[PDB]
Design a protein around this ligand. Sequence first.
Ligand code: B12
Ligand SMILES: N[C@@H](CCC(=O)N[C@@H](CS)C(=O)NCC(=O)O)C(=O)O
Ligand SMILES: [Cl-]
Ligand SMILES: [Cl-]
Length: 401
Amino acid sequence: DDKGEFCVIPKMDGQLVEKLGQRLLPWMDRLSSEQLNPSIYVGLRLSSMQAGTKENLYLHNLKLHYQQCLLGCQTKISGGSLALYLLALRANCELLGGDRMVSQLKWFLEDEKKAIGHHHEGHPHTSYYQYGLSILALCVHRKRVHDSVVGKLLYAVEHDYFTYQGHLSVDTEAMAGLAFTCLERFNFNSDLRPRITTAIETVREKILKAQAPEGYFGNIYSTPLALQMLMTSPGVGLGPACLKARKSLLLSLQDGAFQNPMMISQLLPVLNHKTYLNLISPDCQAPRVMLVPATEDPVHLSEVSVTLKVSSVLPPYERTVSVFAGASLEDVLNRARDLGEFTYGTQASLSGPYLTSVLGKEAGDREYWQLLRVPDTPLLQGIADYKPKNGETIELRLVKM
Ligand code: B12
Ligand SMILES: N[C@@H](CCC(=O)N[C@@H](CS)C(=O)NCC(=O)O)C(=O)O
Ligand SMILES: [Cl-]
Ligand SMILES: [Cl-]
């Protein structure tokens, strides 16, 4: 590739990548319906690493869970979650399909298309991220959806719906590009083909323009999906752009990034030069090294002082607490709660605990609790993974989606 047209990530530190995989390994034993994440299975299968027989047991439990929750299930499965399960099936070389899951995912897309409306003036009940992910998951199972469904996602890309105040929301843009790439390879939605092929170029160009001087695309956690999109096909400047991203990824791993299992599961494929598009026709005898358990570090003795602020409740709340150095924001919330007259609530997600209430105020429709480093810098990690530094002030703020 003397011309530098292929997006590659060469010469990654072997032990940083091993340790990244070892962070997923313990999660292979968390098999309850409340903790299963099909993206973990996909990410491991597309990676240079494996967990042996634990993978087969994980897939067995995924199958029982998604089969039980088709419309003894406990919580309603979103379209995107079912889509990730479809990706897990392809990672084991299994093909669906009148399949009930295929139909359920198609009807999810129909519901979201209706929410968006004929004038693209509405919004999905979930997100354009889940919309694109669901189109992609159907496509890799060789299943087409109606042009009217695909048109909504094309329109959003064509009208730059995922750029806000000049900043591209890279993850959703990249996911849309992955879906479009799959449609193009099957020649699905052929009446939309010129739009599809241009939109692939638009996504790639917008991703490249979102590259920061440091080398990440948007932010370090959007970079895995951005790299998937760039790796689907060679292009001018991709070699050089992806070498900058390599530098950013290495520095981030050295600095302790990528603790979150969902994020690890998005990064592992691209470190192995694979993407979700490999799930059309995947190698199911891929070369992968067995992971072994990491050794856990000694107890952290130092402490950090962190101020927790909530101004979207009446009366507002502010308290400085101390926790062990390396404790999470969740630990800070727990310490504040222990000190009295502070409460919070969460719900499970495939990314871990999602903050849903603070001081008795539950996020309503189209609202969420945003986590910020004062002043006004949104955190890049959620409560379980963000580790506050001494002297930081963290704000919880209820905002409109
Ligand atoms: C859509 C989305 C949101 C929406 C979710 C609501 C909706 N309308 O669906 C909104 C805008 C509310 C949101 C909020 C946040 N998000 Co967000 N989000 C995403 C996105 C684009 C897609 C998620 C999705 O649908 N996945 C597919 C479905 C099937 O999976 P799921 O687990 O069932 O989806 C749920 C969770 O993702 C959850 N949620 C969304 N984001 C986050 C982040 C964390 C850490 C957790 C625990 C949960 C959570 O909401 C989804 C719907 O219920 C991802 C992109 C990505 N690369 O994954 C980023 C992403 C997951 N979010 C991220 C972050 C950091 C946040 C926030 C912490 C930002 C902040 N500073 O407040 C908050 C969450 C705080 C809290 N209250 O706990 C990061 C996480 C990185 C990491 N290291 O883990 C990502 C990767 C984006 C990025 N590149 O920065 N998010
Ligand atoms: N509107 C988009 C989602 C945009 C979005 O919620 N982006 C959040 C996700 S946490 C974000 O701030 N992303 C980081 C960024 O844009 O840099 C969709 O429908 O998929
Ligand atoms: Cl992380
Ligand atoms: Cl609460």
